[PDB]
Paper text:
Angiogenin (ANG), a 14-kDa basic protein is an angiogenic ribonuclease and member of the bovine pancreatic ribonuclease (RNase A) family (also known as RNase 5). Like RNase A, ANG cleaves preferentially on the 3′ side of pyrimidines and follows a transphosphorylation/hydrolysis mechanism. In addition, the crystal structure of human ANG has revealed that it has an RNase A fold and the catalytic triad (residues H13, K40 and H114) is conserved. The enzymatic activity of ANG is several orders of magnitude lower than that of RNase A towards conventional RNase substrates, but essential for its angiogenic effect.
ANG residues H13, K40 and H114 (part of the P1 sub-site) correspond to the catalytic triad. K40 is a key residue at the catalytic centre of ANG and adopts multiple conformation in the native structure. However the conservative substitution of Arg for K40 reduces the activity to ~6%, similar to the effect of the K41 to Arg mutation in RNase A43. In the crystal structure of the ALS variant K40R, the Arg side chain possesses a single conformation and several key interactions of K40 (with residues Q12, C39, N43 and T44, which are integral to the catalytic site) known to be important for the stabilization of the pentavalent transition state during RNA cleavage are lost. Instead, in the variant, the Arg side-chain makes direct interaction with Q112 by reorienting its side chain (more solvent exposed).
Author numbering: 3 to 122
Write the structure that this text describes.
Amino acid sequence: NSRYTHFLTQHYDAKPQGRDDRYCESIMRRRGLTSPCRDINTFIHGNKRSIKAICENKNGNPHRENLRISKSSFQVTTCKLHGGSPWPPCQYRATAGFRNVVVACENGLPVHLDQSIFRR
């Protein structure tokens, strides 16, 4: 279940404080997403068990072809790449949000975040 682990690395941050541009620039580095700079990436906050619950009917509904959509809303932060280059230094604009999320699940664990709902 390294895909679950990969999901957490790319898309989970339990307790941020700020959630500003600087937060994005830092955490995108910390999580290895800056070579090349990922165009857009969203982190989910709070506890893990609520996110795992999306894979059950406890906190999820089936969605489109192969995805799950959460019933609860999550605090999230979307980091969007600013500037012309794919390469570091990666400047990010932060957007804090509060809504449900879309994931793909495998063996009851989230393994993908659908980034499309945050492209705005």
